[PDB]
RNA sequence: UAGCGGCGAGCGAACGGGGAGGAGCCCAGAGCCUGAAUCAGUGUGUGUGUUAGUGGAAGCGUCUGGAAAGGCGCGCGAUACAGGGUGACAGCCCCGUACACAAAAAUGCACAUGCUGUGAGCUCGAUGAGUAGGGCGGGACACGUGGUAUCCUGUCUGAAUAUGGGGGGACCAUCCUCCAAGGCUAAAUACUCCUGACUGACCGAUAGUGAACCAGUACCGUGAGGGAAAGGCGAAAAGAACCCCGGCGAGGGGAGUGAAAAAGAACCUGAAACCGUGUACGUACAAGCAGUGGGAGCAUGCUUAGGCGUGUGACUGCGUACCUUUUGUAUAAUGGGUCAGCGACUUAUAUUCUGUAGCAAGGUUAACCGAAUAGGGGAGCCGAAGGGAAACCGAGUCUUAACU
């Protein structure tokens, strides 16, 4: 049978041109008023997955 | 060109299709794949599941001095098991059109270099009789041959069944293993023309 | 393609049991026991190629040390006597000479007495 | 060449790992899978994205976005693969019969992929600013 | 993939496209006219299968040998060299085979077809009510009540019925499309107790069925049920008349048969553990993984006037099995009485990487038809473009009012 993609992983990562994956930063859902705006600003844009935890992502979604 | 043995006519052929370097790996792959495609692969053993018997424990886990057993059907036990039982399976491995054509083009060109390929004009026996075909191959110094023909004639095809060293394929139905197998290939001028257009 | 393995196994066991020929009891008869014996034999054999070169040196030294003390010099002073006279002759031969040609050997002890 | 004299290219075939076949084999007794633990066990090994019970990366991170229904049915026509249809008319249905874009694609776009020669009148397709310069430089009109 | 999902584990479409295969109808009924299409009894000649079968080509001499089919020499058939048997391996000895044939009788199909027995075409109409829908509770849909369409119904209700109604994924309005609440229908599709032929990089007696053998047997269990072991003399029984020892025994030795009787029915080959008998050497003051270095003697085959090669091994240096598991094992931790046989990284499909081969801005086909692994088939897939949540823009683009 075909490999099933880990769907939850498909909904949190997106494949970039070179091969890596963009993902949204954690700590930006609730409890925002106590956070400084400089954090919240820096957490807003999408960010790349580190080389340590890349193999875990590549495994759980083999298609794209 | 392909010189004939009863005419000496300059039969012009494509320099590619009948004049390439011998790509050995390609030909080996195509002939191995062809030979694989011949396998029917009809077999099975029976796993510990499929063997007849019960799922009873022969003896209880403890207390007995025996080595803890769980089934009479286990592969380490005699009579019933075979750990990785076989199953019927399609061995027919895939071969790229271009690789197959390229391999034929290759092996069909080495018959010119090695002088196995005896290209001829009209090749047909009188009546459906092996006796005649046998007598006419004696003139040509041929014994083991693959007589490839354009118009497949009953007179010829029916006079080469019983001859083990003579096979009569149609120009459409040439094969990688067959061209290599037979000591000579007696090809008809029409068959060369068909094979030329087929391989391209 | 099922592979029976009785022809090969037998040949493999029979090979080792041929190397264990001469050993006591099960060590010659019984593959499972022989195979250990044949390995340990090889281990000891490998070891004792090293020990052979040690034992013989001792043996020779003890012959030379005996043969020199009959002439009145100890092995320790004798070898220094030979080395200070730049004599290149080894223990193997000195020990051979000591036994066979004592009248010759005596000359080396004089040659050593010079130094 | 004979049926026997054939041989493969050097490097093509590589035998294959055969575990549990003596000392000399190298791998043999614990078929290259160490001593004990879940990974040594037959049918062992943890599932994908399992970090020992720590909350996995694909769950500690937040989920974002929505999949567009429209993007599925739009195409990105490379300018090089444009003069391969019917002289110089590329509506959409003509471009589809050339097998350049899929059947269920109603919107399409011609981007600056490079290389045009013949004059192509592009009618209906949305055209890029870089491609509009090229297509017109070659001679072709738009709309 | 879109979705679903303690948005976890996992579950997972549809539209659309390519193929196989194709076919449609009948009632809720009046008309002029009607046996016409149709499927319907059954006969009925037919075809051409099935159940018995018939014919079916061409070899000879020498050489080993128990025996020739084998070696060598000369031939001959071949629409037949598939295969099996015959005293060893047979195109021509036999049985078959290709091929040509064959039914008194019983049947399976495929066209005429007399017909108990059956209606087209018309006009006109009608066009499925406790039903659709709803509330309540459940289940089915990829879809877990979720914004949840659609389907089914236990329960309580309840329309309009063709200017009518259902559906287009909450819902509404326009557009579009269909006609529910009555039915029927071959093919492509699934399967093989069983029958016939043929085929295997399937097994060859611990394998292959549990079962090559009188096996679902012996045997075990109150019973349901479980469930073995066990193949082979030789070409031919020519299966050992007779004589001898013994109890008219078993068993043996002769004789005879045979190529062979260490092929004598406990029968091809006949391994190992294990047990003997005979030789050579060692061994009754010597301590221990039993060997290994060194090494005398004795016994030996050879040669030769050389020494070796073996067998043994007095004395002597060193030396605590193997596997496992462990920081670490002679360990008094595990496992093994021995031998022989079997006994554990496979398979399929996806995916990524490496080698390799093809072709390269291209590469490649799937099911499918075809009959021969070719050739079609490019439906599709992957690549040549990315950024953005997305619209969208695009060698850029997102960010932001804009960004050096
Ligand atoms: K025997
Ligand atoms: K000791
Ligand atoms: Mg990319
Ligand atoms: Mg920072
Ligand atoms: Mg994909
Ligand atoms: Mg090569
Ligand atoms: Mg079962
Ligand atoms: Mg039970
Ligand atoms: Mg015990
Ligand atoms: Mg079995
Ligand atoms: Mg494979
Ligand atoms: Mg076999
Ligand atoms: Mg073997
Ligand atoms: Mg000894
Ligand atoms: Mg022995
Ligand atoms: Mg030393
Ligand atoms: Mg040293
Ligand atoms: Mg010195
Ligand atoms: Mg290599
Ligand atoms: Mg393999
Ligand atoms: Mg290795
Ligand atoms: Mg290792
Ligand atoms: Mg290796
Ligand atoms: Mg081991
Ligand atoms: Mg272990
Ligand atoms: Mg453990
Ligand atoms: Mg481990
Ligand atoms: Mg399991
Ligand atoms: Mg398991
Ligand atoms: Mg695993
Ligand atoms: Mg297409
Ligand atoms: Mg621009
Ligand atoms: Mg939770
Ligand atoms: Mg399911
Ligand atoms: Mg599943
Ligand atoms: Mg369409
Ligand atoms: Mg089509
Ligand atoms: Mg379709
Ligand atoms: Mg079709
Ligand atoms: Mg068909
Ligand atoms: Mg059809
Ligand atoms: Mg069709
Ligand atoms: Mg039809
Ligand atoms: Mg119609
Ligand atoms: Mg109809
Ligand atoms: Mg009604
Ligand atoms: Mg007939
Ligand atoms: Mg007959
Ligand atoms: Mg005959
Ligand atoms: Mg004679
Ligand atoms: Mg005679
Ligand atoms: Mg003679
Ligand atoms: Mg004779
Ligand atoms: Mg005789
Ligand atoms: Mg004869
Ligand atoms: Mg001979
Ligand atoms: Mg002749
Ligand atoms: Mg023959
Ligand atoms: Mg014989
Ligand atoms: Mg022969
Ligand atoms: Mg003959
Ligand atoms: Mg035969
Ligand atoms: Mg012959
Ligand atoms: Mg016929
Ligand atoms: Mg009849
Ligand atoms: Mg008759
Ligand atoms: Mg009849
Ligand atoms: Mg109706
Ligand atoms: Mg009604
Ligand atoms: Mg409804
Ligand atoms: Mg309802
Ligand atoms: Mg509604
Ligand atoms: Mg509804
Ligand atoms: Mg409702
Ligand atoms: Mg209510
Ligand atoms: Mg409700
Ligand atoms: Mg409801
Ligand atoms: Mg519910
Ligand atoms: Mg459900
Ligand atoms: Mg939701
Ligand atoms: Mg909501
Ligand atoms: Mg609705
Ligand atoms: Mg109506
Ligand atoms: Mg109307
Ligand atoms: Mg109307
Ligand atoms: Mg209305
Ligand atoms: Mg309406
Ligand atoms: Mg609809
Ligand atoms: Mg609907
Ligand atoms: Mg509506
Ligand atoms: Mg809608
Ligand atoms: Mg929807
Ligand atoms: Mg829909
Ligand atoms: Mg409306
Ligand atoms: Mg209706
Ligand atoms: Mg109507
Ligand atoms: Mg309804
Ligand atoms: Mg209906
Ligand atoms: Mg209903
Ligand atoms: Mg109903
Ligand atoms: Mg209906
Ligand atoms: Mg019917
Ligand atoms: Mg039918
Ligand atoms: Mg066949
Ligand atoms: Mg075969
Ligand atoms: Mg087989
Ligand atoms: Mg066999
Ligand atoms: Mg058996
Ligand atoms: Mg046997
Ligand atoms: Mg047996
Ligand atoms: Mg059984
Ligand atoms: Mg009983
Ligand atoms: Mg037997
Ligand atoms: Mg018999
Ligand atoms: Mg026999
Ligand atoms: Mg007798
Ligand atoms: Mg008497
Ligand atoms: Mg008597
Ligand atoms: Mg008596
Ligand atoms: Mg008596
Ligand atoms: Mg008597
Ligand atoms: Mg008597
Ligand atoms: Mg007797
Ligand atoms: Mg006798
Ligand atoms: Mg006799
Ligand atoms: Mg005789
Ligand atoms: Mg004999
Ligand atoms: Mg006897
Ligand atoms: Mg005799
Ligand atoms: Mg014998
Ligand atoms: Mg008897
Ligand atoms: Mg016996
Ligand atoms: Mg016996
Ligand atoms: Mg027997
Ligand atoms: Mg025999
Ligand atoms: Mg026997
Ligand atoms: Mg015996
Ligand atoms: Mg023995
Ligand atoms: Mg003696
Ligand atoms: Mg003695
Ligand atoms: Mg003695
Ligand atoms: Mg003594
Ligand atoms: Mg003594
Ligand atoms: Mg003792
Ligand atoms: Mg001691
Ligand atoms: Mg000792
Ligand atoms: Mg002596
Ligand atoms: Mg002597
Ligand atoms: Mg010796
Ligand atoms: Mg020690
Ligand atoms: Mg010691
Ligand atoms: Mg352990
Ligand atoms: Mg360990
Ligand atoms: Mg342990
Ligand atoms: Mg411990
Ligand atoms: Mg111990
Ligand atoms: Mg220790
Ligand atoms: Mg112990
Ligand atoms: Mg202790
Ligand atoms: Mg102890
Ligand atoms: Mg213990
Ligand atoms: Mg333990
Ligand atoms: Mg152990
Ligand atoms: Mg024990
Ligand atoms: Mg594996
Ligand atoms: Mg792939
Ligand atoms: Mg790559
Ligand atoms: Mg290139
Ligand atoms: Mg192409
Ligand atoms: Mg088919
Ligand atoms: Mg088509
Ligand atoms: Mg085409
Ligand atoms: Mg096409
Ligand atoms: Mg790529
Ligand atoms: Mg921009
Ligand atoms: Mg801007």
Swiss-Prot record, chain A:
Comp. bias intervals (Basic residues): 9-21
GO BP annotations listed: translation
GO cellular component annotations of the record: cytosolic large ribosomal subunit
Keyword Cell inner membrane recorded: no
Keyword field contains Ribonucleoprotein: yes
Pfam families (alphabetical): Ribosomal_L35p
InterPro entries: Ribosomal_bL35 (IPR001706), Ribosomal_bL35-like (IPR021137), Ribosomal_bL35_CS (IPR018265), Ribosomal_bL35_sf (IPR037229)
Keyword entries, A-Z: Ribonucleoprotein, Ribosomal protein
Region described as Disordered: spans on this chain: 1-21
GO molecular function: structural constituent of ribosome
Similarity comment: Belongs to the bacterial ribosomal protein bL35 family.
PANTHER family registered for this protein in UniProt: 54S RIBOSOMAL PROTEIN BL35M, LARGE RIBOSOMAL SUBUNIT PROTEIN BL35M
The protein's name in its UniProt record: Large ribosomal subunit protein bL35
UniProtKB/Swiss-Prot annotation, chain B:
Record's GO cellular component terms: ribonucleoprotein complex; ribosome
NCBIfam families, sorted: rplD_bact (TIGR03953)
UniProt-listed Gene3D superfamilies: 3.40.1370.10
Coiled coil: none
Functional summary from the UniProt entry: One of the primary rRNA binding proteins, this protein initially binds near the 5'-end of the 23S rRNA. It is important during the early stages of 50S assembly. It makes multiple contacts with different domains of the 23S rRNA in the assembled 50S subunit and ribosome. Forms part of the polypeptide exit tunnel.
Keywords: Ribonucleoprotein, Ribosomal protein, RNA-binding, rRNA-binding
Pfam (any one): Ribosomal_L4
Claim: Ribonucleoprotein is one of the keywords in the record: yes
A GO biological-process term: translation
Protein name in UniProt: Large ribosomal subunit protein uL4
Swiss-Prot record, chain C:
UniProt-listed InterPro entries: Ribosomal_bL20, RIBOSOMAL_L20_CS, Ribosomal_protein_bL20_C
Gene Ontology BP annotations: ribosomal large subunit assembly; translation
Annotated Gene3D superfamilies: 6.10.160.10, Ribosomal protein L20
GO molecular function: rRNA binding; structural constituent of ribosome
CDD domains: Ribosomal_L20
Gene Ontology CC annotation, any one: ribonucleoprotein complex
Record's keyword annotation contains rRNA-binding: yes
Keywords: Ribonucleoprotein, Ribosomal protein, RNA-binding, rRNA-binding
Keyword Ribonucleoprotein in annotation: yes
Top-level taxon: Bacteria
Pfam families on file: Ribosomal_L20
Assigned protein family: Belongs to the bacterial ribosomal protein bL20 family.
Function: Binds directly to 23S ribosomal RNA and is necessary for the in vitro assembly process of the 50S ribosomal subunit. It is not involved in the protein synthesizing functions of that subunit.
Protein known as: Large ribosomal subunit protein bL20
Organism field: Escherichia coli O45:K1 (strain S88 / ExPEC)
From Swiss-Prot, chain D:
Gene3D superfamilies documented for this protein: 3.100.10.10
Region annotation (Disordered) ranges: 1-54
PROSITE patterns: RIBOSOMAL_L15
Keyword Repeat (UniProt): no
Biased composition (Gly residues): 21-31
Highest taxon, organism lineage: Bacteria
Molecular function via GO: rRNA binding; structural constituent of ribosome
A Pfam family matched in the record: Ribosomal_L27A
One GO term describing the cellular component: cytosolic large ribosomal subunit
SUPFAM superfamilies: Ribosomal proteins L15p and L18e
Keywords, sorted A to Z: Ribonucleoprotein, Ribosomal protein, RNA-binding, rRNA-binding
Gene Ontology biological-process entries: translation
Family the UniProt entry places it in: Belongs to the universal ribosomal protein uL15 family.
Function: Binds to the 23S rRNA.
Quaternary structure and interacting proteins, as annotated: Part of the 50S ribosomal subunit.
Protein name: Large ribosomal subunit protein uL15
